[PDB]
């Protein structure tokens, strides 16, 4: 059986187990965010997605 | 209308607010060609490589 | 001009592969194990020198 | 969750060429593919890049 992914961004599909944690704003915080890994504060923003 | 698609570079612009304003297709003509080497929508008077 | 060309490559060279599985170590270390981790980091650190 | 796939029988081959066998949980994938098949014992030295 030959399990084929795409592990590019990892925007969304099998997660494996997803413990959560609650957002935090305006600290240098650790990130894991749906796959996306990273370390920075995180501000509200006015960008239009 | 009915026209098909084809492998192309395309130099796209993002205005302030996050939306295509324009475009330019690299293989068009030489002036094209030249926008996508510097990636400017304008160039100056000269010989460009 | 000069030194904005320079530095803007210097950050451009941290968006290449190098011959590695990815351009970004956090993805490289979540993603294999410490042995192959290593060959993967080796070919990023030789290009970024 | 991979705790029934480990839960299986002993395997002849586990090959995982770009992933860590362990950490396929911490990771999210993007769309993922699998393959089924049976195959002699020696063609399985064939399934591989
Ligand atoms: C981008 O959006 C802003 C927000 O209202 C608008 O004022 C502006 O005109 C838009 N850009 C263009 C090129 O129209």
Redesign the interface.
Do not use: Q
């Given at each position: 059986?030959?399990?084929?992914?795409?592990?590019?961004?990892?925007?969304?599909?099998?997660?494996?187990?997803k413990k959560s944690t609650n957002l935090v704003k305006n600290k240098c915080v650790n990130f894991n965010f749906?796959?996306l890994?990273?370390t920075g504060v995180l501000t509200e923003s006015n960008?239009?997605? | 209308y009915v026209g098909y698609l084809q492998p192309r570079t395309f130099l796209l612009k993002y205005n302030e607010n996050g939306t295509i304003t324009d475009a330019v297709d690299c293989a068009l003509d030489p002036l094209s060609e030249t926008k996508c080497t510097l990636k400017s929508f304008t160039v100056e008077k000269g010989i460009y490589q | 001009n000069h030194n904005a060309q320079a530095l803007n490559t210097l950050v451009k060279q941290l968006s290449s592969k190098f011959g590695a599985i990815s351009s970004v170590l956090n993805d490289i270390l979540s993603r294999l194990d410490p042995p192959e981790a290593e060959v993967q980091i080796d070919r990023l650190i030789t290009g970024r020198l | 969750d991979y705790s029934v796939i480990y839960n299986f029988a002993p395997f002849f081959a586990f090959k995982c060429y770009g992933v860590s066998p362990t950490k396929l949980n911490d990771l999210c994938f993007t769309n993922v593919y699998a393959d089924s098949f049976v195959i002699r014992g020696n063609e399985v030295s064939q399934i591989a890049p």
């Open positions: 059986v030959v399990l084929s992914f795409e592990l590019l961004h990892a925007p969304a599909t099998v997660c494996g187990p749906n796959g890994t990273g960008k239009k997605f | - | - | -």
